[PDB]
């Protein structure tokens, strides 16, 4: 393998509310091997428009996995998990143009609009 994965999270829709009182304040967390990224949060919404851009280095295209989490930012208690999605880098590498772009289903509910572009080295 070996490449750079460009990730754009455009938005999420229909997220599961996790806030004890009020509406959750979502942000994106990305993880690939030892790399982590976190977007700024958006207050009081289950339908955030993030337009979040990141890049992660890929060390083995065949086996690497990108882990996406959507979390509720909290000030006093632990941030709570709203939804997750795993992307296998092999799926990106198989796609025409090494590009994937669509509205995907989060676990356990909600949708996420993403663009994933792999540049191979
Ligand atoms: Ca809130
Ligand atoms: Ca919160
Ligand atoms: Cl890993
Ligand atoms: Cl922020
Ligand atoms: Cl980044
Ligand atoms: Cl998943
Ligand atoms: Na998009």
Numbering used by the authors: 474 to 594
Could you give the paper's own sentences about this structure?
The structure was solved to 1.5 Å resolution using the selenium single-wavelength anomalous diffraction de novo phasing method. There are two molecules per asymmetric unit, both of which contain aa474-594 of TbE-Syt. The structure showed that TbE-Syt-C2B adopts a type II topology, consisting of eight β strands that form two sheets and a short α helix in the loop connecting β6 and β7. Additionally, there are two tightly bound Ca2+ ions, which are coordinated by a few charged residues in two extended loops on the opposite end from the helix. The interaction is mediated by a network of hydrogen bonds between the Ca2+ ions and the side-chain oxygens of residues E492, D498, D545, and N547, which are all highly conserved in trypanosomes. The main-chain carboxyl oxygens of residues V496 and K546 also form hydrogen bonds with either of the two Ca2+ ions. In the TbE-Syt-C2B structure there is also a basic patch on β2 and β3, which contains residues K502 and K511 at its center. Superimposing TbE-Syt-C2B onto each of the three C2 domains of HsE-Syt2 showed that it is very similar to HsE-Syt2-C2A and C2B, with average RMSDs of 1.05 Å and 0.75 Å, respectively, but substantially deviated from C2C, with an RMSD of 3.57 Å.
All known E-Syts contain an N-terminal transmembrane (TM) hairpin, a central synaptotagmin-like mitochondrial lipid-binding protein (SMP) domain, and three or five C2 domains at their C termini.
